[PDB]
Amino acid sequence: STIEEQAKTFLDKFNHEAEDLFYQSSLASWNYNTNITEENVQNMNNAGDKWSAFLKEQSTLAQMYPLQEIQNLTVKLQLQALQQNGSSVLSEDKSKRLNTILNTMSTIYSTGKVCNPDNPQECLLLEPGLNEIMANSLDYNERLWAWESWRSEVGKQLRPLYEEYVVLKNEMARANHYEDYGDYWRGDYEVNGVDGYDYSRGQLIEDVEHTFEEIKPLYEHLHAYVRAKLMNAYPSYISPIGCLPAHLLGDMWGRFWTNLYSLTVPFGQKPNIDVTDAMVDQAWDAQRIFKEAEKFFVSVGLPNMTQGFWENSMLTDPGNVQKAVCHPTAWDLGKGDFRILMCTKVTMDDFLTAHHEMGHIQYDMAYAAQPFLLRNGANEGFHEAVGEIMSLSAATPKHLKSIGLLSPDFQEDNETEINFLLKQALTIVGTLPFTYMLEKWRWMVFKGEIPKDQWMKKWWEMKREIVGVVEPVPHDETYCDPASLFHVSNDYSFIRYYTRTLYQFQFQEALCQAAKHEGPLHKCDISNSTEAGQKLFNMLRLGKSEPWTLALENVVGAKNMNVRPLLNYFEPLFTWLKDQNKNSFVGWSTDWSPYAD
Numbered sequence: 001s002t003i004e005e006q007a008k009t010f011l012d013k014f015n016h017e018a019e020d021l022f023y024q025s026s027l028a029s030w031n032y033n034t035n036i037t038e039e040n041v042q043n044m045n046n047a048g049d050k051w052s053a054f055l056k057e058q059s060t061l062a063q064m065y066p067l068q069e070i071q072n073l074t075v076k077l078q079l080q081a082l083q084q085n086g087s088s089v090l091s092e093d094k095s096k097r098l099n100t101i102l103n104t105m106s107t108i109y110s111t112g113k114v115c116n117p118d119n120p121q122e123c124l125l126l127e128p129g130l131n132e133i134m135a136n137s138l139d140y141n142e143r144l145w146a147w148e149s150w151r152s153e154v155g156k157q158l159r160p161l162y163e164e165y166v167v168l169k170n171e172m173a174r175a176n177h178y179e180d181y182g183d184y185w186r187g188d189y190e191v192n193g194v195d196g197y198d199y200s201r202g203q204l205i206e207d208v209e210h211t212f213e214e215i216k217p218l219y220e221h222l223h224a225y226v227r228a229k230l231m232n233a234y235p236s237y238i239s240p241i242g243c244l245p246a247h248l249l250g251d252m253w254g255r256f257w258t259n260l261y262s263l264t265v266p267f268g269q270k271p272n273i274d275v276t277d278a279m280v281d282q283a284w285d286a287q288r289i290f291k292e293a294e295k296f297f298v299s300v301g302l303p304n305m306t307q308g309f310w311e312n313s314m315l316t317d318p319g320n321v322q323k324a325v326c327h328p329t330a331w332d333l334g335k336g337d338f339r340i341l342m343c344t345k346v347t348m349d350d351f352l353t354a355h356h357e358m359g360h361i362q363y364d365m366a367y368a369a370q371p372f373l374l375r376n377g378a379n380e381g382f383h384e385a386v387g388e389i390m391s392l393s394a395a396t397p398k399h400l401k402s403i404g405l406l407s408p409d410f411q412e413d414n415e416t417e418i419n420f421l422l423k424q425a426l427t428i429v430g431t432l433p434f435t436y437m438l439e440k441w442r443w444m445v446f447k448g449e450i451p452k453d454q455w456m457k458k459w460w461e462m463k464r465e466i467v468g469v470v471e472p473v474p475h476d477e478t479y480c481d482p483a484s485l486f487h488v489s490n491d492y493s494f495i496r497y498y499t500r501t502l503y504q505f506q507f508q509e510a511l512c513q514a515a516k517h518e519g520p521l522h523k524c525d526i527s528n529s530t531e532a533g534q535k536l537f538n539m540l541r542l543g544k545s546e547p548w549t550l551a552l553e554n555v556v557g558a559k560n561m562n563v564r565p566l567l568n569y570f571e572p573l574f575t576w577l578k579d580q581n582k583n584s585f586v587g588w589s590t591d592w593s594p595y596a597d
Contacts, residue, residue: 003069010065011078014058015372019334022372025051026333033341034314036323058082074545076193078373089175090168098168102491104161109489112154114146134251135259140237144472147247151484158489159480163452165491166445173446182446185439185493189379191547197559199549205443207561208495211502212436214563215429218570220586221577222429223468226257228584229264241585242592243470246463253485254469255497257430261423266576267415273397275405279346282405286315286344289351292403293358296394300526300533302362306338309361313339328353330360330387334375338365348395355394359387367543378539379548381499386540388500389508393526402527421522421573428501429570433467435498440466441482442494453477461590468588473595505565506556511536521569 028047032040062082070076087095114130116122122145124130133146166181173184183201191199223244230238230248238245250259279289294305318324326343333339340357344350363386367375377383393399397416400406441459444450450458456477464470475481487494512524514532526532539554549559556562567574 003065004072004075007065007070007075007079008072010062011075011371014082018054018058018372021051021054023333023335023337026331030331030333030339030341033325034318034322036325056086056088059084059086059088073193074371074374077545078371081373085176087172090171094168094171097164098172101161101165101168105158105165105483105489105491106486108154108157108161109484109486112150112157114149114153116145131251134247138233138263140234140248143247147252148473150252151479151481155479155481155484158483159478162480162483169491170446170448180443180446180448182443185442185495189548191549194547194550197547197549199547204495208436208440208498211561211563212433214567215432218567218574219429219433220468221574221581222425223588224581224584224586225577226260226264226426228581233263237594239592239594241589242594243464243468243588243590245472245594246469247472249469253434254467255431255434255485257426258423260430261426264422264426266418266422270413270415270419272419273400273406273410273416274348275351275400276347278405279351284346289344289346289354290315290358293351293355293394296355296390296399296527297358297362299528299530301530301537302533305361305365306336308336309338309340312337313341315340315342315344317343328357330357330364332364332375334368334372336365336368352391352395356388356391359390361387363387363540366537366540369541370543370545374543374545376544378542378544378546378551379496379499380493381496381501381503382548382551383500384496385500385503385507386536389504389511390526392504392508393524396523396525398523398525399527417520417522417572418576421570424522425570425573429566432498432501435494435501437463437466438482438485438488439493439495439498442488456481464588464590470590470593471595499561502561502563502566503552505569506552506558506562507536509565509568510555510557520572521565522572 025044025047028040028044032044059082062079063085065079065083067076067079067083070079087098090098110126112126114124124133130146130150134143137143137146169181173179173181176184178184178187186201186204189199189204190201191197227238227240227244230244231240234245234248238248246254250257298304314324317326324341326341328342330340331338338361340361342350342354342357344354360383363383364375377386397406397410397412401408401410441462445455456475456479459481460471460475482488485494486492508524508526509521511526511532512521514535515524515526515529517524535555539551542551542554546554552561553559
């Protein structure tokens with residue numbers, strides 16, 4: 001007879017019906033990506049449309065209950081994302097236009113081919129095509145062609161479409177009582193009604209511009225080291241004084257710098273750590289790799305994974321008889337059912353991605369006690385943070401020796417950790433400034449901070465200022481650089497690739513403090529210590545029922561998100577580049593331009 005009892009009863013009819021349909025829908029998607037077939041493609045389409053209709057019905061039904069009368073935080077959290085109108089705020093023409101626009105977004109991206117009209121042989125696909133020539137190239141113009149030419153057509157046919165995209169989504173957000181779409185993407189770190197833990201959306205920029213300011217030193221030395229190394233490859237192209245060419249950063253955009261390591265090794269003569277040589281002679285396979293990662297999780301208290309998981313997940317490619325998209329992803333079908341999509345191969349990386357997904361698996365299986373709407377990451381960067389630390393404990397030599405994969409007489413020296421942390425920072429430290437830039441750019445564009453004529457001049461002006469790379473040749477306003485990314489074209493949030501980074505280091509620091517690890521943090525490990533696993537599981541079962549500041553408190557003890565764990569992690573590395581840069585130029589100047597003639 002009261003609004004709060006009615007809301008709870010509605011939530012029971014919701015969670016008792018929504019899971020039965022989402023289970024069926026996720027089953028259809030899993031079946032389609034297991035059997036790439038025109039029979040399968042319509043199955044997960046109608047499965048998704050059924051759930052899209054059901055959630056729209058529940059969204060228009062749940063708005064009758066006011067949120068100003070509810071006092072239970074769980075019910076308020078459940079109703080908050082459900083009473084959100086979503087795309088229904090717009091007119092029918094606007095809705096159809098936005099769906100068509102989005103359908104065109106990734107259409108141009110995926111079906112965007114590159115070819116040379118004068119060189120028929122200079123034709124190649126994207127994966128394992130276009131990415132390859134950006135991944136293993138030592139030539140300058142061989143990268144210039146595949147870099148400009150990629151956004152020559154794809155980076156142009158998205159400029160006005162993206163202009164329409166931004167103005168439709170601005171009205172998408174504004175009709176939601178939001179300032180801009182950037183303030184809608186900051187909408188899930190938003191917390192209301194919690195005293196001392198209330199998290200305003202605008203505080204994200206305050207946190208981000210602050211936390212980046214202490215990374216900026218270490219990243220400046222890392223950029224200086226890579227530049228001081230790079231004239232070995234391009235002595236006639238790059239000024240050691242100026243910034244870097246963007247086409248020489250490892251791939252199409254520069255997100256990951258991982259493939260830069262092979263030429264910028266700190267110590268080449270040191271035999272790199274390698275177990276790729278060691279499973280092959282040990283007769284290891286996909287089943288054993290997952291069984292072994294299971295012992296890693298069990299050692300810290302994370303329990304034995306379900307029986308049906310093994311009978312229903314796929315680990316090896318099922319040959320040619322059918323096609324299966326096997327990007328690294330872990331699937332939560334719900335209802336206690338969990339299957340993993342992995343093209344497993346005998347290599348550390350595929351072992352490391354197996355562990356990274358294993359983190360997703362046992363994180364996801366914990367909050368089955370949480371309601372359906374709450375069965376999600378505590379925040380958007382919170383899932384690719386929890387499932388990655390456990391990989392960082394799989395690639396440690398102390399772990400590899402504990403399992404016998406590495407040599408029992410394998411020596412680790414002052415030149416070993418430098419190579420290891422350089423490889424990791426070229427993956428984890430180089431990605432942070434570009435995640436920060438991309439989302440800052442999205443925020444200053446959704447705010448309308450920029451007019452059309454400066455929709456790109458500042459972009460290059462700002463990446464010449466934040467990351468420290470210049471353009472070998474300029475672009476005009478007709479171009480559209482950031483849309484070339486998958487997460488920009490397909491309208492995804494990218495800052496989950498910044499926040500996860502500074503979440504996982506806090507997690508690993510807290511856990512190897514709980515394990516009472518004595519030594520540098522990069523050698524920390526979590527295995528064979530139940531006291532850190534039990535600490536992690538207490539947060540892990542929360543899901544989203546509590547806010548992310550309190551989730552950070554539960555493991556680390558701080559509501560804020562900090563850089564201190566990351567700088568402590570790379571302190572052995574940081575001191576090293578302090579020694580290596582006694583003669584190099586720290587800092588950059590934007591006035592330099594390689595085409596400035």
